[PDB]
């Protein structure tokens, strides 16, 4: 059966949580990936260098002996955030990028953004020092339909921003529409994107047809088929400014399977093999390593990993659940068979 | 505060299940409604007069003393179903209508329909004897997107059927699109429809924005806002061939809140007040009684109820759950406040 040797990949979009879950989930990433963009959306969020330095250490405490893993920390953008604070953390090599979560006028200034025009100063600073901006591209006005929120973000926020700040390096994170696929495809060298395994593998029918399936519920939300196909074609194309970001967003089973299930997929354990399946299905394994291992590093301006991992096309059963201190974690594709696996 | 006196209403679309749940759920309907269309989608489904007569009796056993309730039984249409069997049950007054669930070529002939062209004989018989056809209007081919399935059904099944059988009386059950709203609005006297409280009250954003909410997950699936508004306008219009059908589809909480939650809303307990809210919100309480109490009877060709119930605009808390032999039932709008209630 078939062996596939690639560079040690990176995860350029990851939530590792905190506390007893941070311990549970880090091994699934640190065992396979060399570096990962850790998100700042904790409670409270990571908006200072002290919080970031501290959190980074907590991650390192969770890393198994022998694992060579490096968490690349990011900063949660808020209205109250001081440009000097972000500038300092970037200079000291604490922050790699800053993350912009959807704007909302009601949002408390300590916990997020009211509008993009409000945080212009820090965005202008990010431009000067050449710091990458990571973007959750969704407009969250109540009137806007959930399946339109990514598309709307491009018109009314993204394009105007990138025109205003021509020199800003922007990662359009976890794109899920043909709209975004095109936007990035036709954009310049300062615009890139990450794509999750679930957004390539499935569409909204998988989440809803024959029952509601909360473990495929995340954001941005699985769109219809024509959008799915767009993403698979973009990565298969060989376009060199898409790269691996899992958006591994683990929630306890009781939280996912409730009257109001949380958004997020714990895919870290199965993502790499899952990607490797989609690239094989698209007859595009020649562009696989690049997507994993090169394109992200090349965009962020970091050295590429110097070690290699192997994948094997031996079919493997995914775990039904992972034990947590309380409750469990249902992984992405739990109990399912996968075509590819790490040796 | 405000009192609203109307005729004793009917529910022209209802699932009452069987066994220990049938006992749990009948009181919620029998206490308020005079008559109700009970669906045949049991396991095994109701496809004989013996099964129907028997099931009818089981329902009557579940009805509290003093409640004047009459279950109007229906037949599940299958390929193997004998026209003479349906003709006999209709003549004997066992069957009121026959229900057509979505076609599917793989479906076992004892449990459903492969295609509409296959069951033409029984449909032609239904036409002759003037028996109403009830329709779940969705095409269930895998390729078709879930939010397009009702719209597709109109083009490729409904219109061709109604042209083929010009004299057939068809209830387009629980319509959920502007497409269906228009179709029925502009149709003839032999075409009517039911509409649920959830399809008037909410749209898909309510189910998905800020978490996945399985207790609003049913079929047909909540569409986007422009479809919601269409339904509210149609009922508010005063159009006299829409009428109350709850599609009360109760599932145990552990079944709704799982890795694969079932489709259905247990709305029977809160539906009437919920409808009364939407008609008030649409400034259309003059057409409320009709929708509840007259239009259905008028379409089915039955006498209208001769007793009256009162509603009051005293705000009332909905139960968080109802106790089942095992597990519980989370009702529609559980723990919520409602504006209208029965006295
Ligand atoms: O971390 C999460 O809970 C999470 N899950 C998501 O599916 N999307 C997000 O944008 C996010 F922040
Ligand atoms: O009875 C059910 O489970 C059910 N629930 C639904 O939401 N739609 C149906 O068509 C149906 F048969
Ligand atoms: Zn995100
Ligand atoms: Zn994320
Ligand atoms: Zn139905
Ligand atoms: Zn039904």
Question: Would you write up a description of this structure?
Answer:
2 copies of one chain form a homodimer. By secondary structure, chain A is of the alpha/beta class. Chain A has one domain (1-343): Metal-dependent hydrolases (TIM Barrel). The first copy, chain A, is 34% helix and 16% strand. Chain A has helices spanning 19-30, 49-62, 83-91, 120-128, 149-164, 178-185, 197-201, 204-208, 225-237, 253-256, 271-281, 288-293, 295-300, and strands at 3-7, 10-14, 35-38, 70-76, 95-100, 133-135, 170-172, 191-195, 242-244, 308-312, 316-317, 322-323, 328-329, 337-338, 341-342. In chain A, strands 2-3-4-5-6-7-8-9 form an 8-stranded parallel beta sheet. Chain A has a 3-stranded antiparallel beta sheet with strand order 1-10-15. A two-stranded antiparallel sheet of chain A has the order 11-14. In chain A, α1 packs across α2 (49-62). The complex binds the ligand O=C(O)c1[nH]c(=O)[nH]c(=O)c1F (2 copies) and zinc ion (4 copies).
The helix fraction of chain A, in percent, is 25-40%
| List of distinct ligands in this structure | the ligand O=C(O)c1[nH]c(=O)[nH]c(=O)c1F, zinc ion
Assembly status: homodimer
Q: What spatial form of chain A do the alpha-carbon principal axes imply? A: globular
Q: How many beta-strand segments of chain A?
A: 15
* C-alpha Rg of chain A (nearest Å): 19 Å
Terminal CA distance of chain A reads 12 Å
Overall number of domains of chain A: 1
Strand order of the largest sheet of chain A: 2-3-4-5-6-7-8-9
The CATH topology of chain A:
TIM Barrel
DSSP summary: helix tally of chain A: 13
Order of helices and strands of chain A: EEHEHEHEHEHEHEHHHEHHHHEEEEEE
Percent of residues in beta strands of chain A: 15-25%
CATH class of chain A: Alpha Beta
CATH architecture of chain A: Alpha-Beta Barrel
Structural class of chain A: alpha/beta
Largest sheet of chain A: 8 strands, parallel
Q: Biggest interface in this structure? A: A-B, 28 and 28 residues
CATH homologous superfamily placement of chain A? Metal-dependent hydrolases
Binding site for Zn(2+) 1 (chains A, B): 13, 15, 99, 247
Pfam family, one (chains A, B): Amidohydro_1
Modified residues (N6-carboxylysine) (chains A, B): 99
Binding site for Zn(2+) 2 (chains A, B): 99, 136, 174
């Amino acid at each position: 059966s078939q062996v596939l040797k690639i560079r040690r990949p990176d995860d350029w979009h990851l939530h590792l949580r905190d506390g007893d879950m941070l311990k549970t989930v880090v091994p699934y990433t640190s065992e396979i990936y060399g570096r990962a963009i850790v998100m700042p959306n904790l409670a409270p969020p990571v908006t200072t260098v002290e919080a970031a330095v501290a959190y980074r250490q907590r991650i390192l405490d969770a890393v198994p002996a022998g694992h060579d893993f490096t968490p690349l920390m990011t900063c949660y953008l808020t209205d109250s955030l001081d440009p000097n604070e972000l500038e300092r953390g970037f200079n000291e090599g604490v922050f790699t990028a800053a993350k912009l979560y959807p704007a909302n006028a009601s949002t408390n200034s300590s916990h997020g953004v009211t509008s993009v025009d409000a945080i212009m100063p820090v965005l202008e600073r990010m431009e000067k020092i050449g710091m990458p901006l990571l973007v959750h591209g969704e407009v969250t006005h109540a009137d806007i339909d959930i399946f339109d929120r990514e598309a709307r973000f491009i018109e009314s926020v993204m394009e105007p921003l990138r025109q205003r700040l021509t020199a800003l390096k922007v990662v359009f994170e976890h794109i899920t529409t043909k709209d975004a696929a095109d936007y990035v495809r036709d954009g310049n060298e300062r615009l890139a994107a990450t794509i999750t395994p679930q957004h390539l593998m499935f569409n909204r029918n998988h989440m809803l047809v024959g029952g509601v399936r909360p473990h495929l519920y995340c954001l941005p939300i699985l769109k219809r088929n024509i959008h799915q196909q767009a993403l698979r074609e973009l990565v298969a194309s060989g376009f060199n400014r898409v790269f691996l970001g899992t958006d591994s967003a683990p929630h306890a089973r009781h939280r996912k399977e409730s009257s109001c299930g949380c958004a997020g997929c714990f895919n870290a354990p199965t993502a790499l093999g899952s990607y490797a399946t989609v690239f094989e299905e698209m007859n595009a394994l020649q562009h696989f390593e690049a997507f994993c291992s090169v394109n992200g590093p090349q965009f962020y301006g970091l050295p590429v990993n110097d070690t290699f991992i192997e994948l094997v096309r031996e079919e493997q059963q995914v775990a039904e659940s992972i034990a947590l201190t309380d409750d469990t974690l249902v992984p992405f594709l739990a109990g399912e068979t996968v075509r590819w696996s790490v040796k």
